[PDB]
Symmetry: none
Subunit: 126 residues, 4 copies
């Protein structure tokens, strides 16, 4: 369905924003994560604060009631090695809902026009 397509896109965007490490996009990624997170999950993410980690989304299963499961890989390279480096696999378990986009900043609403908000997020090894 369309609501599923929607949720799968934003769950995927969230994991990419939150799990990537890229020096030159990190301020932008950090900001994106706050704009897609509820106030308390945003406060909780802020409290966890050259290599490059890239994310591959493998699959996403929303339960249709505000939990989603995202299987994904992270590939961490020392920038100044040749290959793609070490790849590990993970499962994000993500609570989320949609808020009134008027109830956020104007900038937040441009980044997050549907008002998608992660309310909880946990990552476990696959």
């Amino acid at each position: 369905s369309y609501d599923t397509v929607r949720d799968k896109y934003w769950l995927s965007q969230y994991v990419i924003a939150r799990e990537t490490y890229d020096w030159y996009t990190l301020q932008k990624d950090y900001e994106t994560v706050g704009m897609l997170s509820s106030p308390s999950e945003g406060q909780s993410y802020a409290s966890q604060f050259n290599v490059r980690t890239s994310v591959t989304i493998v699959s996403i299963v929303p339960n249709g009631k505000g939990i989603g499961t995202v299987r994904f890989a992270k590939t961490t390279k020392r920038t100044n090695e040749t290959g793609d480096g070490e790849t590990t696999h993970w499962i994000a378990t993500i609570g989320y809902q949609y808020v009134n986009p008027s109830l956020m900043s104007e900038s937040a609403r441009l980044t997050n026009p549907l008002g998608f908000n992660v309310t909880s997020y946990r990552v476990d090894p696959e």
Copy 2:
């Protein structure tokens, strides 16, 4: 009355589709749940198959509807048994009893796809579905 007959038919069709596991009806059962559900309930059902490659065609769970009570104001209660047999075997398998409580309405049927509107021209639509064990 006619609303009661209509509602009782659909509640039972919903429980049968949603609670049956049979490899040879599965595609049809799966599509019926989709046509008859809100997107959230649809996805709630469908997400358990995103179970069939766990069970394949070795397990069959069939439903027996025991009573159907529409409770007024778009809620209905369906008592039913589910019976699971490994597909090899004669024997009765294991039977458990359940109560599905079901929030439902009739939506604009024009919004649905072609095939959905043939099967569900009245727009039966489940917005909440919950199964609890049978007690008193």
Copy 3:
């Protein structure tokens, strides 16, 4: 895969923005079509709210056309098909018709947009052809 998810998201967002007529979301819809479209396609949409013909002048606040997305199939080679319903009523159920949008699309360099556009569309989704035909079923 992820590309399918991305494509299907943007294809539907496009059809919702472009086919919806709702006074209270019109300014946002209009702007979203602009961000997601080629100059041609953008002006093709925008042109219907210009001159004395402007659709909003001739509807105002008294008509609402809402969209239900029914299926989205990316067809490969940057073409996608969105089946959808449009439901119009003046402010019962109003009038529902079914439609097929065929959409040529690509991902362009996202720096070429105003920074507003790049916040909303950082991947650079860009529609270069848009056509709606009536639903006929299959055969």
Copy 4:
């Protein structure tokens, strides 16, 4: 607030029901967890379900928006072994008519846990 008093009570009841091990009450406890759980969380609990362990609630902090943190101890049985834990619990309230009559007698306010995770302290 009252909403907080309410949430602390049901969150504490949930952890008591879900983390206690008592042979003579295990079936009632199992049933209680189902009646206090969303449909999906009830399915998930039932799958993962496979001495006497008693629960002591130490504190309950709801965030006011559907997440609660419960710090608690489990004591298995002189004294026995006590370990310490943190349940992170998502929850909401649903219309009590959307559940069975029996469910609704155990859970009159329609409290539903939508997610549950326990971590060591």
